[PDB]
Amino acid sequence: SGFRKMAFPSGKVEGCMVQVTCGTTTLNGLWLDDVVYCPRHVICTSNDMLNPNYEDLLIRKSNHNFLVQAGNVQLRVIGHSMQNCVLKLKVDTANPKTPKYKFVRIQPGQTFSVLACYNGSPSGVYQCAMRPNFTIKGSFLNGSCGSVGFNIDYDCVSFCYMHHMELPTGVHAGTDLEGNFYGPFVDRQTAQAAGTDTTITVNVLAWLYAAVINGDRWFLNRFTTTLNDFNLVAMKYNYEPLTQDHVDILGPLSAQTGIAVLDMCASLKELLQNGMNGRTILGSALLEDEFTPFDVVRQCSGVTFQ
Amino acid sequence: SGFRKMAFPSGKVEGCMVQVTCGTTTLNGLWLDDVVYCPRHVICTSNDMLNPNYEDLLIRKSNHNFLVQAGNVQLRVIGHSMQNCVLKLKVDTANPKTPKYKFVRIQPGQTFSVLACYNGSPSGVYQCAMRPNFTIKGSFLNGSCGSVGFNIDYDCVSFCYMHHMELPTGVHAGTDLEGNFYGPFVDRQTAQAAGTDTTITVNVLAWLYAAVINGDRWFLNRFTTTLNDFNLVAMKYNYEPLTQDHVDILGPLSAQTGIAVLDMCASLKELLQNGMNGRTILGSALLEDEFTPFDVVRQCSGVTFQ
């Protein structure tokens, strides 16, 4: 039946992507109810990125200085505020395409779907993960600021990510929908250390379980490890330590497939110290880490979101 | 700015995914205007897959024997016909969410976005490619028949794929929207040879150009090849022969980046005979082949579809 990096259907989010232009800079906004959410750096200019006094810069801005454009119907702002690193612009009308929504601050290792947008128009959707150092690698060209990451819980859209900036290292950073950055990043153009990044071990094991369900089983062995033994191998290869909670999350995959979690760990232990030896695991010769154990269950069971 | 397997925004397609149930079997349909398109094997049963007489089976079926369900509004069929391997059911009402659409029979090597559906409800979207042997690897669980692949040309949705069956080899086959299968496949459950599969060489080179734009340039060398010399290496590694047309399609990427096409070919020639030696190319140690040269341009320029 096969397995893939699946992205949520982006229909419910496309109807909220608007275009926010403040004087010089243009970027994307999120129109829910009668409010538009956008990155607060839309009020800056090119030179302002070096060191922005956002409170004084916003003071210079009036309501009519904000031009919000949803397709071809232009929205009248009548209120504005700065919550952390985002703007909250009250507009004339409620978004009639507003879905049921939850603002959620997700955790590292969690995955979500990103809808890349430019001047308020959708371009593409893909699945990525919040890396342990609170970065996400991205496909964010010039003017993609304000793109949103999200999950969908059956009928509700859980907004978690808003893309702000791009680091000089090439990876990207953003906030939740309340403006607080993920990680130590601030919205200015300075040298911003990404910090060391490890591999989400829970995601790697759940990915191995999915491969067992979809044909590839050459890595299965009849050697074990203990939780402490596998851990001493994990940090030598810069893998996250595996708590008992991570074992319990893998419980459903452990039962349906009949391989104990620690049996999967020793397969991973053997893959770290000996590589893959030319073979692959579902079309990839790398240890994929952007699949949560929940994501594996949706793809192997067939959970729908409408 | 990074690069990824991007999928088209699936909003315009979500509004057409309906549920078609005929007696025993349930699968997905495509509701455009006043017509529902679905795989013709919905009128079969479990045993009928061995050898179906579709013309005699459809004769036993009447209009009321077809239950089309769009969310919670049930559609009245008033006409039915069998065009090749698909059904055409005229319904009571036009789909008010119908987009501008083109039915297109795509070619091997071309890519498109698939919206996986179950009982008529969307589940996920991802980008795949029509392999040279007219197969696509898939993530198609039980009841995903009728899922559609599509491209979007700025404002028009080009429907190209409809998933029918799953081969015993694990890969999948389908038709266009006129019912003609891609490849030699027929809609019955028998041993169906997938045929040999090669690697889309044009896609691999365009993928290398994208990596040059996004940081990774370690594979760039100051050795060349000729078109005939690279070809003798290509078929030894089961790669498609490179025509002059394939060189010309890579023209825009060749100019913007300043590396001649044949210079990229010798980098590929060197990657085939010596592997990757531990290094990667945009987070992958495999020669990706599901990126058309057009796809590379959209992601590096920022083309929008609304």
Residue numbers in the entry:
A (entry chain A), B (entry chain A): 1 to 306
Q: Which statements did the authors publish about this structure?
A:
SARS-CoV-2 Mpro is a cysteine protease that forms a dimer composed of two protomers. Each protomer comprises the chymotrypsin and 3C-like peptidase domains I and II (residues 10–99 and 100–182, respectively), with the active site consisting of a Cys145-His41 catalytic dyad located in the cleft between the two antiparallel-β-barrel domains. Mpro cleaves the polyproteins at 11 positions with a consensus cleavage sequence Leu Gln | (Ser, Ala, Gly) to release nsp’s, which are required to assemble the viral replication-transcription complex. In addition to the indispensable role in viral replication, SARS-CoV-2 Mpro also plays an essential role in escaping antiviral defense by cleaving host cell proteins.
